[PDB]
Amino acid sequence: STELTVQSERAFQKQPHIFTNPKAKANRKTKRWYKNVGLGFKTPKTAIEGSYIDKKCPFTGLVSIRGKILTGTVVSTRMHRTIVIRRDYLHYVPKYNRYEKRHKNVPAHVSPAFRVQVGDIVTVGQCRPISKTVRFNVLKVASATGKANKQFAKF
Amino acid sequence: TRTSVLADALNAINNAEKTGKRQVLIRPSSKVIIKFLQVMQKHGYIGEFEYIDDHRSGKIVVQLNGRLNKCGVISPRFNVKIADVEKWTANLLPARQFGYVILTTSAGIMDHEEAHRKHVSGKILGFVY
Amino acid sequence: MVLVQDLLHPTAASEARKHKLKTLVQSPRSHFLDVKCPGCLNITTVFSHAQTAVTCESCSTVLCTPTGGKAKLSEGTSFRRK
Amino acid sequence: GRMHSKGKGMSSSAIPYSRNAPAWFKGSSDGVVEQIIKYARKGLTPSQIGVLLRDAHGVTQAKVITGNKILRILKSNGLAPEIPEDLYFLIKKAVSVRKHLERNRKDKDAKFRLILIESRIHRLARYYRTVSVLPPNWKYESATASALVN
Amino acid sequence: MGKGKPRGLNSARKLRVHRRNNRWAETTYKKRLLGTAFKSSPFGGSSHAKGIVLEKIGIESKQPNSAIRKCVRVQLIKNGKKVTAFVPNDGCLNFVDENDEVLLAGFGRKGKAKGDIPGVRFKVVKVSGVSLLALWKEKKEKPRS
RNA sequence: CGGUAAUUCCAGCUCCAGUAGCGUAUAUUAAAGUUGUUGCAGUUAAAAAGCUCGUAGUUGAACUUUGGGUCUGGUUGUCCGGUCGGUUUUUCAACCGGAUCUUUCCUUCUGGCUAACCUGUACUCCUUGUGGGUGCAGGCGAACCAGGACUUUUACUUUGAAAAAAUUAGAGUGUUCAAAGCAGGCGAAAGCUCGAAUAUAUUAGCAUGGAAUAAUGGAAUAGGACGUUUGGUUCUAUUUUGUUGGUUUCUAGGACCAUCGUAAUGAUUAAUAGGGACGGUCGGGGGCAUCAGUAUUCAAUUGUCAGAGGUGAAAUUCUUGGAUUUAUUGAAGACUAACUACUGCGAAAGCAUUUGCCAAGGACGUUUUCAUUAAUCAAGAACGAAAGUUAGGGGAUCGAAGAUGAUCAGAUACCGUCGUAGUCUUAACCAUAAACUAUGCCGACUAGGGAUCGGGUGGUGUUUUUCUUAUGACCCACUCGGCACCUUACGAGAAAUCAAAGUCUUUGGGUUCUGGGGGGAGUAUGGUCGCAAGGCUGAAACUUAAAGGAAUUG
RNA sequence: GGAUAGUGGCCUACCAUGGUUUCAACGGGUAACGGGGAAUAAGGGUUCGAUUCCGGAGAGGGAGCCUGAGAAACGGCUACCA
Ligand SMILES: [Mg+2]
Ligand SMILES: [Mg+2]
Ligand SMILES: [Mg+2]
Ligand SMILES: [Mg+2]
Ligand SMILES: [Mg+2]
Ligand SMILES: [Mg+2]
Ligand SMILES: [Mg+2]
Ligand SMILES: [Mg+2]
Ligand SMILES: [Mg+2]
Ligand SMILES: [Mg+2]
Ligand SMILES: [Mg+2]
Ligand SMILES: [Mg+2]
Ligand SMILES: [Mg+2]
Ligand SMILES: [Mg+2]
Ligand SMILES: [Mg+2]
Ligand SMILES: [Mg+2]
Ligand SMILES: [Mg+2]
Ligand SMILES: [Mg+2]
Ligand SMILES: [Mg+2]
Ligand SMILES: [Mg+2]
Ligand SMILES: [Mg+2]
Ligand SMILES: [Mg+2]
Ligand SMILES: [Mg+2]
Ligand SMILES: [Mg+2]
Ligand SMILES: [Mg+2]
Ligand SMILES: [Mg+2]
Ligand SMILES: [Mg+2]
Ligand SMILES: [Zn+2]
């Protein structure tokens, strides 16, 4: 979400230490470097076919996914390239021997490879500290459509 | 609403057995009910029981034996961690000696003695003593 | 009705007596009465609890005035059972 | 025991033993299906239809004879309305009380009821939205509800 | 009956918030949670209090019984508050004397009046560093004046 | 407890308890099921919001793979000790697995190792043999990898890995005993030698099995599933063409629209759940509109000459220039009797003269339709008696205030007489009542009796009688819905009592709320709401041994 | 970009309007250092944990820094307050 412009800051952003040789004359021009992420996660072609740079993407960046591979649905999407994943869970309380439905929203960076909307479930890997709160990175929008192509009643 | 059918059924049983009716009717009638009853049959708290098919929902006729005392149900199906069985059965049944705690589990719906042999616990449903 | 009733096989008196809902099996006690109007020689399968001013197949004869329970069959009319 | 009042009835249709047909009551699956889709173009609702099918003609249930229910027939021919049948009948009644209140400023027990019917609708809508019949972020009420009717 | 309280396997919070907010009618728990002991209760929520005998009072008791009780108004040292302490045993306010440091104790009742002494919640123990019982019985002797 | 025999004060002797300790004070845990998850109460003892709606919450009907065989591993009791108090099988057992076969896949392949013989290539080392194996082209893959492809996801539970030590429990051991400690033990007593465990800690994460339970999900515009599809479309792209830069192939892997087929092509119920449609009904339900009775009042005209009102026993108080009484009206704004009940409807509050209109509603019936929409609910709302309040209209009588006449030691109190505010209404508010069934809502199930009513069935029943009638109205039996009694309680309950206040120490169907000795106090404060009155919300300090409830006898 | 050993709203510029919340955000209180544990002791629990171990803080306050691998040290220093 934003989006599209590729090169549109005061600066002009390249994938650092990666080159698009002017002497050489390939069809792509831009050598789109990309990362195989591991942990059984497939590299989505929207990253490798696409345009955007992003430092903070796992695929098109130096961001290395590790550690806790959390999940949960997506509540908030409004900000630039990040998401807020709502990781619901229970909390056991022995003096009762029952459960609290607890909440914690997890802010998590989006590589624009994926299309993320509200009410979508999403696996998401811990990585470097991206930002203040965002220590996490969208890796797999599981509800890619979630009845998006199909509403639609009248035969 | 009619919530725990199992309970709502076992309640009728417990009322029937209290007065000494030789049978009872049980409206809703589930798997759990029938696997719960089946258990009572395997130990012998319960006679025949005859699952009517309303071309529909369920319905059961139990034959009581004059052997049930209480046909318990514990209500929020508490998860039980194998050792904690001992604390349930201790607190629900009269005596280490005899009684059963009907618990659903991985294995299906056992009683608490069968579940100890198997070494497999889970949630509780009810009990009988 | 006290202690031992053997509840799978009621006497049909009870089944007929008890609510059409409150038996061993919910079986309705309505029928599709095959009414013949005085006009045309053709038989309409009139459900006994119609809820509607039931006309014939085409001609506007008016067969059954829908009352609360079973419908009063309009005027001197004749019918078969089910 | 009813949604809104404290009256606990079982005014009910029973449904007979046979999922199968009552054979002798004849016609056909296709003939009845064609019978239905005339009434779907005449504007009549599944609930009205099935009365007409049952009362005059030899149908017991469309479920029985066709296999499909009725709304499910109508949908298959594209004749089910945008706003569902049941909801529509409440949205009508809502309007028929919102209209009566606009005239009668002082009339409390109708205001009471209007608060019920409104709530009944938002029960049903909130149901239907979650099914994915009506599109979500769409509230079914009062000002625009008069337009949703007609 | 459902028996009032909720019973869900996921209730918990509506138990644990309920039991926070009923406890508050348990007078044991309220004093502990609101520091009445510290903020009030002349002694600072403390076993005892040294306090200077401001005057030897005779307090006429409540009914059934009838006796003037021989007490001492004190000025608690630390707080500067003034209280009224009972002086146990035959006379023995004689042994207390006037303008002495007097160590006090609760009477027993966790505040409140011990029996018939209306508005006295304390017993003298040590008068200027002895012990009234040691004086009264005369096993020990007072350190002169 | 203590007023001259005080078993409680104070002293001697006895004596009790504990004992090198025991008392006292404050905490605190237990006792306290007096904080209650297990596990409390709420008709009256404290406690059910006046009522309904209602978001979060919490909870939520039933339904999808069951059963039978066939072998095969254990593990203790048995059958003798077959044995030098211990051990190894069988005659037997239950119990826990494992493999399978049953319309059945356990995730599937691209390849590595195909262990094995399903084999049969030479057929025989050889008791007359299907006892036995040197042995390799087709080839059973589970005997393991090592890489794809893509996993419905959870909760739940398993054993596992981890949860520092001391602590905690606990094994070993002569610190003399222990409390402990990690020591110790045995020789020729020239050297040797056991130990320093195990368990727990369950919250979260990680591991793996299990698939009941509970949720979640998939094909209903099939854009669905597969593949001998046959076209294609976009690829991507390594491997050889000497090696670089191409272009197009053959091809093997993506991905994407076509079209040809394959299969049983794909929706569970239709909850004595709910909603919604229809039907006839029912109602003192509500709004708005009219009609009455008839009533009281004043006034009119009318008539009749001493009192009429009032009285609680008794008085005061009023007119006579007929008040009152008698009769015709008029106005006004009221109410809306008798019927009227252990009757109706309404969420309650509340609602009875009439018709009319306005929408709503319960029950009912229903082989109608949707298919989880449902129950209860902190926030928020809607209504909400009377009084009060602003602002209007009216004011008959009663009638908070007041005057005033008696009585009594007195009495601004009854009674007495009058009588503003109101009462009544309309437009605003207020938002509480013994708004009380002092009984939260839903849910189920237990006992009969007879009735009672609003629905519905059957009676060649009876009578109506206009000839058969057919409605109506009963009788009688049973039924869904409503409102209450009788007896025993074997069930509850402290009991009164209660068929719910039962199905509760044999403690668990779901949910909301409230209470934790009495007072202080529904106060102080602070919010917040109100025109205000006041509401909602809501303290402690201090105080006190009882406050109650129910019943028993007096 | 700047800084840092390094990640980062850690800092700066320019841009966007997010972020948390009745599953109690924020605020207040704490006679609160956290945990191991302690007492109590059927089960469930309650209360306590300044205190022999493990973390974290502090060296009258609050700052700032030298040296040094390691200090925002205080049995180092600079200052201001007390
Ligand atoms: Mg019902
Ligand atoms: Mg409701
Ligand atoms: Mg006195
Ligand atoms: Mg306690
Ligand atoms: Mg209590
Ligand atoms: Mg009470
Ligand atoms: Mg279920
Ligand atoms: Mg020990
Ligand atoms: Mg008058
Ligand atoms: Mg009536
Ligand atoms: Mg009347
Ligand atoms: Mg509220
Ligand atoms: Mg009023
Ligand atoms: Mg007066
Ligand atoms: Mg009240
Ligand atoms: Mg009340
Ligand atoms: Mg109190
Ligand atoms: Mg940077
Ligand atoms: Mg502190
Ligand atoms: Mg602490
Ligand atoms: Mg500590
Ligand atoms: Mg301290
Ligand atoms: Mg330390
Ligand atoms: Mg100091
Ligand atoms: Mg410093
Ligand atoms: Mg130091
Ligand atoms: Mg120092
Ligand atoms: Zn015709």
PDB file of C-alpha atoms (C1' of nucleotides) in Angstrom, chain B residues 1-5 7-8 11-12 15 18-19 21 27-32 35 55-57 59 70 73-82 88 91-92 104-109 114 117-119 121-123 127, chain F residues 37-39 59-64 66-67 95-97 155-159 202-204 209-214 269-273 374-375 442-448 491 502-510:
ATOM      1  CA  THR B   1     -30.320 -22.043  24.783  1.00  0.00           C
ATOM      2  CA  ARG B   2     -29.842 -25.769  25.268  1.00  0.00           C
ATOM      3  CA  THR B   3     -26.109 -25.857  25.712  1.00  0.00           C
ATOM      4  CA  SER B   4     -24.422 -29.066  26.949  1.00  0.00           C
ATOM      5  CA  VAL B   5     -26.768 -31.702  25.581  1.00  0.00           C
ATOM      6  CA  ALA B   7     -25.384 -32.641  30.684  1.00  0.00           C
ATOM      7  CA  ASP B   8     -28.981 -31.887  29.770  1.00  0.00           C
ATOM      8  CA  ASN B  11     -29.665 -34.686  34.093  1.00  0.00           C
ATOM      9  CA  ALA B  12     -32.773 -36.524  32.888  1.00  0.00           C
ATOM     10  CA  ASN B  15     -33.800 -37.656  37.679  1.00  0.00           C
ATOM     11  CA  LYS B  18     -33.546 -41.000  41.444  1.00  0.00           C
ATOM     12  CA  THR B  19     -37.267 -41.977  41.273  1.00  0.00           C
ATOM     13  CA  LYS B  21     -37.957 -45.216  36.527  1.00  0.00           C
ATOM     14  CA  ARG B  27     -34.056 -35.618  23.376  1.00  0.00           C
ATOM     15  CA  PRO B  28     -30.973 -34.439  21.566  1.00  0.00           C
ATOM     16  CA  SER B  29     -28.583 -37.417  21.561  1.00  0.00           C
ATOM     17  CA  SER B  30     -24.982 -37.061  20.340  1.00  0.00           C
ATOM     18  CA  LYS B  31     -21.904 -39.123  19.649  1.00  0.00           C
ATOM     19  CA  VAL B  32     -20.619 -38.036  23.036  1.00  0.00           C
ATOM     20  CA  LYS B  35     -19.946 -42.969  23.720  1.00  0.00           C
ATOM     21  CA  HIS B  55     -35.253 -38.421  10.444  1.00  0.00           C
ATOM     22  CA  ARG B  56     -33.589 -35.488  11.969  1.00  0.00           C
ATOM     23  CA  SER B  57     -31.670 -34.904  15.190  1.00  0.00           C
ATOM     24  CA  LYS B  59     -33.377 -39.301  20.534  1.00  0.00           C
ATOM     25  CA  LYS B  70     -25.060 -40.270  40.101  1.00  0.00           C
ATOM     26  CA  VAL B  73     -21.145 -34.101  34.284  1.00  0.00           C
ATOM     27  CA  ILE B  74     -18.374 -31.595  34.836  1.00  0.00           C
ATOM     28  CA  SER B  75     -19.094 -28.536  32.899  1.00  0.00           C
ATOM     29  CA  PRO B  76     -16.322 -26.503  31.379  1.00  0.00           C
ATOM     30  CA  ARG B  77     -14.478 -29.392  29.843  1.00  0.00           C
ATOM     31  CA  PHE B  78     -11.299 -28.999  31.847  1.00  0.00           C
ATOM     32  CA  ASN B  79      -8.123 -30.111  30.219  1.00  0.00           C
ATOM     33  CA  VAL B  80      -6.447 -32.707  32.415  1.00  0.00           C
ATOM     34  CA  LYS B  81      -2.714 -33.281  32.652  1.00  0.00           C
ATOM     35  CA  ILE B  82      -2.531 -37.060  33.388  1.00  0.00           C
ATOM     36  CA  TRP B  88     -10.420 -35.006  39.762  1.00  0.00           C
ATOM     37  CA  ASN B  91     -12.673 -34.949  44.365  1.00  0.00           C
ATOM     38  CA  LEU B  92     -15.586 -36.385  42.348  1.00  0.00           C
ATOM     39  CA  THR B 104     -12.964 -37.552  26.160  1.00  0.00           C
ATOM     40  CA  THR B 105      -9.476 -37.809  24.749  1.00  0.00           C
ATOM     41  CA  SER B 106      -7.122 -38.508  21.856  1.00  0.00           C
ATOM     42  CA  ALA B 107      -7.983 -42.185  22.412  1.00  0.00           C
ATOM     43  CA  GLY B 108     -11.797 -41.438  22.171  1.00  0.00           C
ATOM     44  CA  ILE B 109     -14.049 -41.403  25.295  1.00  0.00           C
ATOM     45  CA  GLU B 114      -8.731 -47.096  30.933  1.00  0.00           C
ATOM     46  CA  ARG B 117      -3.525 -47.991  31.299  1.00  0.00           C
ATOM     47  CA  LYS B 118      -3.222 -46.274  27.897  1.00  0.00           C
ATOM     48  CA  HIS B 119      -1.187 -43.378  29.334  1.00  0.00           C
ATOM     49  CA  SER B 121      -5.400 -38.016  29.076  1.00  0.00           C
ATOM     50  CA  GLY B 122      -7.480 -35.137  27.779  1.00  0.00           C
ATOM     51  CA  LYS B 123     -10.673 -33.269  28.609  1.00  0.00           C
ATOM     52  CA  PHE B 127     -18.444 -39.462  35.922  1.00  0.00           C
TER      53      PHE B 127
ATOM     54  C1'   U F  37     -12.189 -22.064  40.414  1.00  0.00           C
ATOM     55  C1'   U F  38     -12.789 -26.418  43.283  1.00  0.00           C
ATOM     56  C1'   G F  39     -16.762 -23.984  47.082  1.00  0.00           C
ATOM     57  C1'   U F  59     -21.668 -19.476  26.260  1.00  0.00           C
ATOM     58  C1'   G F  60     -23.955 -22.139  22.053  1.00  0.00           C
ATOM     59  C1'   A F  61     -28.407 -28.429  19.182  1.00  0.00           C
ATOM     60  C1'   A F  62     -27.347 -32.741  16.284  1.00  0.00           C
ATOM     61  C1'   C F  63     -24.286 -34.603  11.536  1.00  0.00           C
ATOM     62  C1'   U F  64     -19.525 -36.833   8.510  1.00  0.00           C
ATOM     63  C1'   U F  66     -18.245 -47.223  12.320  1.00  0.00           C
ATOM     64  C1'   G F  67     -17.825 -52.041  13.093  1.00  0.00           C
ATOM     65  C1'   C F  95      -4.237 -56.302  29.382  1.00  0.00           C
ATOM     66  C1'   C F  96      -1.414 -53.060  26.096  1.00  0.00           C
ATOM     67  C1'   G F  97       0.284 -52.707  21.294  1.00  0.00           C
ATOM     68  C1'   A F 155      -6.593 -25.128  21.111  1.00  0.00           C
ATOM     69  C1'   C F 156      -6.279 -29.920  23.652  1.00  0.00           C
ATOM     70  C1'   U F 157      -3.371 -33.875  25.497  1.00  0.00           C
ATOM     71  C1'   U F 158       1.871 -37.474  25.180  1.00  0.00           C
ATOM     72  C1'   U F 159       6.585 -38.813  26.053  1.00  0.00           C
ATOM     73  C1'   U F 202       3.340 -28.329  35.283  1.00  0.00           C
ATOM     74  C1'   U F 203       2.655 -20.800  33.373  1.00  0.00           C
ATOM     75  C1'   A F 204       5.534 -19.421  27.576  1.00  0.00           C
ATOM     76  C1'   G F 209       2.972 -39.035  18.608  1.00  0.00           C
ATOM     77  C1'   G F 210      -2.695 -38.953  19.195  1.00  0.00           C
ATOM     78  C1'   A F 211      -7.129 -37.176  16.391  1.00  0.00           C
ATOM     79  C1'   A F 212     -12.044 -37.775  20.714  1.00  0.00           C
ATOM     80  C1'   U F 213     -13.290 -32.955  22.456  1.00  0.00           C
ATOM     81  C1'   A F 214     -13.873 -27.790  20.864  1.00  0.00           C
ATOM     82  C1'   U F 269     -29.767 -31.947   9.312  1.00  0.00           C
ATOM     83  C1'   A F 270     -34.095 -28.663   8.939  1.00  0.00           C
ATOM     84  C1'   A F 271     -32.707 -28.494  16.315  1.00  0.00           C
ATOM     85  C1'   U F 272     -40.377 -29.359  20.673  1.00  0.00           C
ATOM     86  C1'   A F 273     -33.160 -23.229  18.474  1.00  0.00           C
ATOM     87  C1'   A F 374     -29.025 -18.119  19.130  1.00  0.00           C
ATOM     88  C1'   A F 375     -28.949 -17.117  25.557  1.00  0.00           C
ATOM     89  C1'   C F 442     -32.684 -18.758  29.406  1.00  0.00           C
ATOM     90  C1'   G F 443     -32.460 -24.284  29.475  1.00  0.00           C
ATOM     91  C1'   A F 444     -33.880 -29.066  30.438  1.00  0.00           C
ATOM     92  C1'   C F 445     -36.119 -33.081  33.662  1.00  0.00           C
ATOM     93  C1'   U F 446     -38.672 -35.070  37.893  1.00  0.00           C
ATOM     94  C1'   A F 447     -46.483 -36.242  40.990  1.00  0.00           C
ATOM     95  C1'   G F 448     -50.574 -37.247  41.092  1.00  0.00           C
ATOM     96  C1'   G F 491     -37.211 -34.269  47.388  1.00  0.00           C
ATOM     97  C1'   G F 502     -36.417 -29.718  43.700  1.00  0.00           C
ATOM     98  C1'   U F 503     -32.596 -32.461  40.325  1.00  0.00           C
ATOM     99  C1'   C F 504     -26.560 -29.051  45.943  1.00  0.00           C
ATOM    100  C1'   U F 505     -20.860 -31.696  50.491  1.00  0.00           C
ATOM    101  C1'   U F 506     -23.952 -37.900  45.718  1.00  0.00           C
ATOM    102  C1'   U F 507     -21.052 -30.131  45.442  1.00  0.00           C
ATOM    103  C1'   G F 508     -19.900 -28.417  37.631  1.00  0.00           C
ATOM    104  C1'   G F 509     -26.293 -26.914  31.721  1.00  0.00           C
ATOM    105  C1'   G F 510     -25.382 -21.515  30.065  1.00  0.00           C
TER     106        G F 510
END
